[PDB]
Design an enzyme around this catalytic site. Structure first.
Site, PDB file in Angstrom:
ATOM      1  N   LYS A  33      47.966  38.637  46.932  1.00 28.31           N
ATOM      2  CA  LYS A  33      48.270  40.122  47.388  1.00 28.31           C
ATOM      3  C   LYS A  33      48.663  40.097  48.896  1.00 28.31           C
ATOM      4  O   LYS A  33      48.000  39.782  49.830  1.00 28.31           O
ATOM      5  CB  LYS A  33      46.991  41.156  47.419  1.00 28.31           C
ATOM      6  N   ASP A 125      32.551  49.009  44.682  1.00 23.75           N
ATOM      7  CA  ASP A 125      33.190  49.343  43.508  1.00 23.75           C
ATOM      8  C   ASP A 125      33.207  48.319  42.386  1.00 23.75           C
ATOM      9  O   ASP A 125      34.292  47.743  42.090  1.00 23.75           O
ATOM     10  CB  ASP A 125      34.646  49.506  44.183  1.00 23.75           C
TER      11      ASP A 125
END
Ligand SMILES: Cc1ccc(CNC(=O)C2CCN(C(=O)c3cc(Cl)ccc3Cl)CC2)cc1
Ligand SMILES: C[C@H](NC(=O)c1ccc(C#N)n1C)c1c(F)cccc1Cl
Lengths: 260, 271
Positions: A33, A125
């Site tokens: 990423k 999350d």
């Protein structure tokens, strides 16, 4: 401590749906990423690098290892291990997992979250998209949205797994029981083979008012002791919900006698 | 939670074993009790002893033993741990002679998982050996400290005048050294001789006669005879043990380093 990588270390790099497949020179296939590409940033490199160091201290068989970090002139990227089968929901949806495999998946989720909490790391999350699955159906827990890492996050169905205490109050710092709620809806997803709550604004009041996933949609055989567990893990009062050490102590015997 | 301070009345019976003793709890089932001291009522070391038991109860992992409770009574001091059915590792190796490579590989992996946890808590195991690797009914293991090496206060309470009651696995740096300051590599040496024992199904050095012959010869280069374990040990495990028992400790890997390589090898080849 450090594995600072350079772009030069990667022979080629095929783009993904800024996530990207990347073949390292000496070390093989990886996933990269590149979080930021732009002007040369104000000196938050030390902060970003110390935060990357903290990600790298998380070393456990059921947790994804950050393999390196690239900080070049106007280019900031993180590099992780390649997980062949992708996220948990994709594995559930793609074709028919046995109870023995799902039971083991749950045990590995428990093992991994227990490690995380043991290192003082609450996962803000947790969800099926953040549970990656390897070629042999073993899993690793991940934080692909960078929720727990404040500086990298700033440099850049999630409500369904979020606990009602957080739906009420956005200023409420999460706890170990925050993730146990998420883990409950993950359990439901594992036996439902789908994302829950098949409009966005309206649903949040209902959940805070007591609503949970439709258990009658688990048309697959799920054992009573796992359904018992998820009801307990998603209780509205956090003090009612168990700890992951408490879940592991019970579930590891249940896995070996019944599921394996 | 805290440590559960138990009373003697909590146990219905207690039959002695190879002072380790089998002990059935009232509500909580079969346990193993090491009664470390029985004599006169001791000077106030209780707070320290209880703090020590509390501290070693923080060591919680699937591949290490739980202290279930502690008994502190007038002139009687005991620790209570979980019952592991098949006993220590050497007893399992000898009394079976029937253990598959897949199970042994898993036993090795569990030893690695456990030692990694211990070192990850900053805890060196001073006396690692097969006697300290306990095996349950399903051949799963948990590491133990049965000599009270890491428990300084309880170990001192044993050696007491008033009480009415390792060299094979020792790293050569510690051989003939009264100021033996251990490291993570101290245990890796021991782990190597454990690996050899797992494939030999026996203690090493059976042709050694004198103790000083053994201690000097090891420091002079000797290890366990690898020609005992070509009967079937994989080459990659024999490679590992040679590396883990290297005379310079800086050559020997860490347990996280061992796990990163060995876990792939277990799943592809051994299981
Ligand atoms: C709470 C918690 C749980 C587990 C972990 C373990 N580490 C991690 O998840 C890394 C977080 C950083 N990261 C990434 O942003 C990342 C994301 C994608 Cl889509 C592709 C490639 C990359 Cl490199 C790698 C994985 C950290 C925190
Ligand atoms: C976690 C484990 N615990 C015991 O070994 C233990 C528990 C109960 C008793 C008794 N009696 N022991 C020795 C332990 C330590 F505490 C310290 C060092 C090594 C190991 Cl393996």
């Amino acid at each position: 401590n450090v594995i600072k990588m350079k772009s030069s270390d990667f022979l080629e790099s095929a783009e993904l749906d800024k996530v990207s497949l990347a073949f390292h020179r000496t070390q093989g296939l990886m996933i990269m990423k590149t979080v930021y590409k732009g002007p040369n940033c104000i000196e938050h490199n030390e902060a970003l690098l110390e935060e990357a160091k903290m990600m790298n201290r998380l070393r456990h068989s059921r947790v994804v290892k950050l393999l390196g970090v690239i900080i070049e002139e106007g280019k900031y990227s993180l590099v992780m291990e390649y997980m062949e089968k992708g996220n948990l929901m994709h594995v559930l949806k793609a074709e028919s997992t046995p109870l023995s495999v799902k039971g083991r998946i749950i045990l590995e989720i428990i093992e991994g979250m227990a490690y995380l909490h043991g290192k003082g790391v609450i996962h803000k999350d947790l969800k099926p998209e953040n549970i990656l699955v390897d070629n042999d159906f073993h899993i690793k827990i991940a934080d692909l949205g960078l929720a727990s890492f404040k500086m990298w996050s700033k440099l850049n169905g999630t409500l369904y797994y979020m606990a009602p205490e957080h739906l009420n109050d956005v200023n409420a710092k999460p706890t170990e029981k925050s993730d146990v709620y998420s883990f409950a809806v993950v359990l439901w997803a594992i036996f439902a083979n789908k994302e829950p709550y098949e409009a966005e604004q309206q649903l949040i009041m209902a959940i805070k008012s007591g609503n949970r996933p439709d258990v009658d949609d688990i048309t697959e055989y799920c054992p009573r002791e796992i359904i018992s567990l998820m009801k307990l893990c998603w209780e509205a009062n956090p003090e009612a919900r168990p700890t992951f050490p408490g879940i592991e102590e019970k579930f590891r015997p249940f896995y070996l006698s019944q599921l394996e």
